[PDB]
Design a binder for this molecule. Sequence first.
Ligand SMILES: CC(=O)N[C@@H]1[C@@H](O)[C@H](O[C@@H]2O[C@H](CO)[C@@H](O[C@@H]3O[C@H](CO)[C@@H](O[C@@H]4O[C@H](CO)[C@@H](O)[C@H](O)[C@H]4NC(C)=O)[C@H](O)[C@H]3NC(C)=O)[C@H](O)[C@H]2NC(C)=O)[C@@H](CO)O[C@H]1O
Length: 303
Amino acid sequence: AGWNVNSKQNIAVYWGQNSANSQSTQQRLSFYCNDANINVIDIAFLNGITPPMTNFANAGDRCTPFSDNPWLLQCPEIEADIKTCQANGKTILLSLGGDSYTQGGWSSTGAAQSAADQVWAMFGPVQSGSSVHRPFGSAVVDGFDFAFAATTNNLAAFGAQLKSRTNAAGGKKYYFSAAPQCFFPDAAVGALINAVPMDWIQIQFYNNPCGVSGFTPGTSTQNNYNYQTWENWAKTSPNPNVKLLVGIPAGPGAGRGYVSGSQLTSVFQYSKGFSTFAGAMMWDMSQLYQNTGFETQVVNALR
Ligand SMILES: CC(=O)N[C@@H]1[C@@H](O)[C@H](O[C@@H]2O[C@H](CO)[C@@H](O[C@@H]3O[C@H](CO)[C@@H](O[C@@H]4O[C@H](CO)[C@@H](O)[C@H](O)[C@H]4NC(C)=O)[C@H](O)[C@H]3NC(C)=O)[C@H](O)[C@H]2NC(C)=O)[C@@H](CO)O[C@H]1O
């Protein structure tokens, strides 16, 4: 039944950017929807908002660009796969931003609110009165992951507008996550996560000295790995019950600070000791499935 707020064994994995970067390393989204251990998948990425742009690496080969927006894709296989994964009990979020989002956000709260309403009309419930293009057709995402990586002006107003629309919606629960890097405070999404309630924060504990590679096994005195800082922040955040996922690279090619073996088991045992801990996040599906035995290491570490 997808995201489980009462579990310490949630696993969120990104799909779409083919980090492993080979012809065969990223199968279609539904290939990965028979994995009992992966209950949340983030589709990466809507890497342009105003104007809209979608990039799904070589999954774009089975999409058709919209005639009036060549950077926006119509993706019938992703549409079908979202519906299949949802039928299979997976929570499917759309990830906004990524390291290729260059638009810098919005100059006004009004522009940010309009942009949020466009994203909601494009990926939320189908709107009968709307002319907006729908990359995933009649599929409806289960929410949004905020993975902005650079200065995004008025991201707080964008997020608050999108949260307003999901809070007003019928049908199903919509989830909000954010993917800050572990450096505290986070420059890209810090203002957003201090203003807008999130269901969980999936912290990138990699590409930075505060990452899992900096964890010191055998002690609960941690000079580098800063989960404790994030837990302290969580308790007074807009959702004081917000959960944290420990985000890690799924292979040595996925990011700096890949860990495995006893370092991996130890940092997860340490993190599991905290009331906010809800499981793991991984970048990304292509790397995870190429890295034989790594998923079993992560599953075994969360037990
Ligand atoms: C606080 C601070 O500024 N820290 C600096 C680091 O940010 C910086 O390294 C960069 O870190 C970000 C965050 O970890 C990283 O982007 C994420 O992580 C992966 C890579 O590990 C990215 O993956 C790429 O995504 C694109 C699509 O946008 C693909 O084209 C490509 O295949 C991916 N590459 C790989 C190898 O997987 C994601 O976009 C993003 N993930 C999420 C959840 O948003 C950047 O890639 C890092 N940049 C560089 C140049 O390494 C670090 C080094 O510059 O310095 C810190 O100080």
